[PDB]
């Protein structure tokens, strides 16, 4: 069944030993082209690559072996010639076509798989349905091992080549198999030739992908050991069946062998749980979320204003004394752009840094705005980033997303804060960031964007007619915050646990964070150094912290209340004092429903 175009499509099989609590993808005609499963695929684990073709296009599958087991591969609803299955049975014809059943290691072929128009997309209500490949020598001994992979089939044409990634849509390949301890092969030693998790990782496996106001192409393609007539549990957003457009239920008992392309419509921020609704098999209990965030973390978060403190914005290998600390977003000054003399550590120790918001962040990306001197252009062309959660696994980001390639194009200009969106989630505490090529010196001032699980610190509405602050009552006086035509100061009375911050809000919402910004109150700002964070429930209520403030005058400095606080009353008696109060206050937050 010769039909379409000829392109390289290389697969292999590197057998390892994977601690529970295997293929990859090569690109050229021969081998030698390792593309690491980045964060875009850092949860597939036992799942190999994702073979991707369209309507009736050639599927080259060169494969071999690297251990003690011949492989093969089965085909479902695909078009191909006779000898392309791999199973010893009766042959009414002679023994000629028997060179696809016992594959010996290190053997390059040239397969030819297709998806017939009537076998691929038919009745176009099924857009991208999930197929699969699997060596059918012993589906109980190699699919139960996880030598596995899908074959996502969509339309014929509209998808940028050769990225073959789903555009305007995400993708999940979760074979919900009961990967048991008694039957593992490549990692286990005993049978080389109670745990219900994707890729056999119980209690864990975070890092699931998501993006707000979109859907998914979810696949519960369970094809292994047919005893897992499972029953899927799913919180967050519900999965309703399409194709057969009359199954908008939401929870579906997972039957083996079958498959369905579910959609869920992510639309509620936060962490949610998973589970397996089988009675005693719920002890698996997956606490795995795909962190839905607020849709409005598209703007910078700490270099223009300056909470990503200018102290540790340091180049690892320094250069004279143009350190990245004196720089700001278009800083009024010639020296305002980090660039170390370019050395030829071709991929390891190029001018790199270590930076952080000093808290947990979900990095959307970094941008920059250059300020060329008069001859020094000061501009970079490409970029890479590595993440380190515990400061010993500084793991690089060589993604393979829709617009992410090996060295995914980050900073590449001289002036425009270039937009870069990290499509897979960022779970990091610190990082090391190294741009490469420039005019003899890589120039960068990072513009970070992030949002934590809540991060609702938007203008809460201090004057929205619902939650006023102008009346700010306390034991230090009602006042005049942005009701001008007035004097230019704030005045307190003493310095101890004196006030009560009865900010007439009286709204039950979810101001997830609080911020204490500065001003210019006739001198240096006086503020609240800290407050015995006392509660504020429905009654005449106080509570010593058994459920810091501003410290420097000029700065959007925040001391977030570590656990979320939500109640009826509003009050925060200040335990300390900056010798007084002197700042037009403006807190930030939002409202949940």
């Amino acid at each position: 069944s010769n039909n379409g175009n000829r392109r390289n499509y290389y697969i292999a099989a590197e057998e390892i030993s994977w601690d529970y609590s295997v293929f990859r993808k090569y690109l050229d005609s021969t081998f030698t082209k390792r593309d690491p499963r980045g964060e875009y695929e850092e949860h597939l684990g036992i799942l190999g690559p994702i073979i991707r073709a369209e309507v009736d296009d050639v599927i080259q599958v060169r494969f071999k072996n690297l251990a003690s087991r011949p492989y093969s591969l089965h085909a479902h609803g695909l078009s191909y010639e006779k000898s392309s299955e791999g199973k010893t049975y009766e042959d009414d014809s002679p023994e000629w076509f028997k060179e696809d059943n016992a594959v010996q290691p290190n053997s390059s072929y040239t397969y030819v798989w297709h998806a017939t128009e009537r076998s691929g997309p038919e009745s176009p209500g099924s857009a991208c349905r999930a197929w699969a490949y699997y060596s059918a020598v012993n589906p109980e001994k190699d699919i139960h091992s996880g030598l596995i992979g899908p074959l996502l089939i969509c339309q014929k044409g509209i998808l940028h080549k050769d990225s073959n990634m789903p555009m305007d849509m995400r993708e999940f390949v979760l074979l919900f198999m009961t990967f048991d301890e008694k039957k593992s092969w490549y990692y286990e030693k005993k049978s080389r030739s109670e745990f219900h998790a994707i890729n056999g990782m119980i209690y864990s496996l975070p890092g699931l992908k998501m993006y707000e106001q979109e859907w998914v192409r979810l696949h519960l393609l369970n094809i292994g050991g047919s005893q897992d007539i499972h029953v899927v549990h799913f919180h967050g957003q519900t999965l309703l069946e399409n194709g057969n457009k009359q199954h908008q239920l939401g929870v579906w008992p997972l039957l083996p062998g079958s498959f369905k392309t579910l959609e869920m419509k992510a639309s509620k921020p936060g962490w949610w749980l998973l589970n397996t609704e089988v009675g005693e098999n719920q002890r698996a209990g997956m606490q795995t979320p795909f962190l839905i965030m607020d849709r409005d973390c598209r703007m910078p978060m700490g270099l223009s204003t300056g909470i990503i403190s200018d102290s540790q914005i340091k180049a690892s290998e320094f250069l004279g004394y143009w350190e990245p600390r004196l720089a700001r977003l278009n800083n009024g000054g010639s020296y305002n752009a980090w660039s170390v003399e370019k050395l030829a550590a071709e991929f390891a120790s190029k001018p790199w840094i270590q930076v952080d918001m000093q808290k947990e962040v979900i990095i959307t990306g970094i941008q920059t705005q250059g300020a060329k001197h008069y001859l020094k252009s000061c501009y970079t062309t490409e970029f890479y980033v590595a993440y380190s959660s515990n400061q010993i696994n500084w793991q690089i980001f060589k993604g393979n997303s829709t617009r992410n390639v090996m060295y995914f194009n980050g900073n590449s200009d001289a002036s425009t804060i270039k937009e870069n969106q990290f499509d897979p989630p960022i779970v990091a505490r610190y990082i090391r960031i190294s741009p490469t090529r420039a005019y003899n010196r890589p120039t960068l001032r990072l513009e970070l964007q992030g949002c934590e699980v809540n991060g609702c610190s938007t203008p809460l509405g201090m004057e929205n007619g619902k939650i006023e602050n102008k009346q700010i009552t306390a034991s230090s006086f009602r006042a005049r915050l942005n009701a001008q035509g007035r004097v230019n100061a704030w005045q307190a009375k003493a310095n101890n646990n004196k006030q009560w911050l009865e900010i007439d809000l009286l709204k039950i919402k979810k101001i997830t964070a609080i911020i204490t910004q500065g001003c210019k109150s006739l001198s240096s700002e006086m503020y609240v150094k800290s407050y015995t964070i006392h509660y504020s429930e429905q009654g005449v209520e106080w509570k010593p912290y058994r459920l810091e403030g501003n410290t420097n005058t000029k700065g959007h400095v925040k001391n977030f209340f570590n656990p979320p606080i939500i109640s009826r009353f509003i009050r925060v008696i200040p335990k300390t004092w900056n010798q007084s109060i002197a700042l037009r206050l403006e807190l930030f937050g939002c409202d949940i429903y």
């Binding site: 006779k82 049975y89 194709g243 009359q246 083996p256 609704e277 089988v278």
Partner: protein, 588 residues
Amino acid sequence: AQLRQFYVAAQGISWSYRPESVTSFKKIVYREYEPYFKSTISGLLGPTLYAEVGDIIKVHFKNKADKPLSIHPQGIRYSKLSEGASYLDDAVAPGREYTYEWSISEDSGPTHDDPPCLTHIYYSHENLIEDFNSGLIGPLLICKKGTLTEGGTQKTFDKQIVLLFAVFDESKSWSQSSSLMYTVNGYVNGTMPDITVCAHDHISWHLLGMSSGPELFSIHFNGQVLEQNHHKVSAITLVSATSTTANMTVGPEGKWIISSLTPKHLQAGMQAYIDIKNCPKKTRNLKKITREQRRHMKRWEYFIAAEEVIWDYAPVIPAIGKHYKKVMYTQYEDESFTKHTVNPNMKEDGILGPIIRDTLKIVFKNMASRPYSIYPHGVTFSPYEDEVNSSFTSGRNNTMIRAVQPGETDEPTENDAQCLTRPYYSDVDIMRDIASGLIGLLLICKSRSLDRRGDIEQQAVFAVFDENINKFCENPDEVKRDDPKFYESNIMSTINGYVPESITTLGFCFDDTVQWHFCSVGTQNEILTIHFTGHSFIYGKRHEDTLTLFPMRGESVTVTMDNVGTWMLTSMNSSPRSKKLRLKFRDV
């Protein structure tokens, strides 16, 4: 906007365990007092819950349990403040009053093509093992806007009640009982009084299903064509975690018993006790003639026997021994009481029964020492030709019309095939008298089948010859039966009949549409799936490659053969049935 202020709490009450009761078993159960807080006909189910578009619902949640038992809606629509789960609103101590904001987003509802309302479950989420093992469930009802009325019933439907297919482990609780016997809505063994509903009612139902123990709950009604999931299905086919429904277009009366069919669903006696009466409703009438040209004045004579014979099955296997007894049906051509009309069991059906394919002039004729049954699916058949094997078996000689002494004689949703498919069984005992080979196969199609003597057919069915005294085997005088170590050594799991796929090896020509009358019968606890080859079906215009099946069911298979090659049909399974799930299939 349809606001619904609610008051719902719990209570610790008892209930009988082995149903046929001083034995007290204090367990927390959901109730519903008089608004603003301070049985033996419905069961242990607690509260109901309406829902319409643009609604906010609270539950003044009271709790009188030392274990802080909360509440969780399987309608996931809720937000952060009303999640009900927790990782590293979850715990309710006594007296803790609660108020939620389960605002209905249109995801938990059908808003389109499901039953008039979707149905999740209304059960907790903290401790599903120990704490939940007490009966803390309930039904939801999120519908299209403008339907429900507070009188417990729907508007566009005559009656609504729900029986839930779940189970709590009566020994994995904090207050355990070392005498195991499971439960389903607390109503097994038919201790539930009849839901005495007559006919002519536009009835609609809800069939919820979750679980706390490992087993499936695919209960089938007894004589009724249902309205489920946009497809004119017949047997309710569902496992746990979700919910099905039932819309019963009734017509005649009687008395039926419903249950699921496994070696566990019928041993203890998980059943019901229904009853039908009379009521004066009258709706639309019937039709009989279509434009005088496409008349189809068709009806066929029939005589189905019942013989106690023995039959030899399998010689050497292609890719005592073979003779075993079997009471199976046989087809006839005349009342002359001669021989087997199918003179050569042509090598496509083999030992598969007669092809039972309009009122009942398709008759039968028992020849044993007791009335034995014939009953098809997909029909709201009139008990005018009953065989009503009700829970109370009437007398053997001179009582009502439930017997047949020896010697005596549905528009499917076009998304399916060009016509639907349905098999049957022996209606005497769906576990004992059906075991010893007493199984037939049915095939209903469309009103497009005519001929004088009465596009390719093929018989097959992955059933099991589960035919469960002394001289009956190779051992001349002393052999044993009903011994699982020996019976699972004689369990003749088979496709189409023979012990394994014997001499009847199936071939096929080229470039012609086929059909396989595939089914699945027998007393095996698992469900199966197929593993076709290099081609695709048309399952609602969804050219797939495989198809699952639940016990006592099996539908059609439409193929578009338009290529050249040879293939081989298989089916995968784990170790207890991998040795059994092998099958041959050839081509030119």
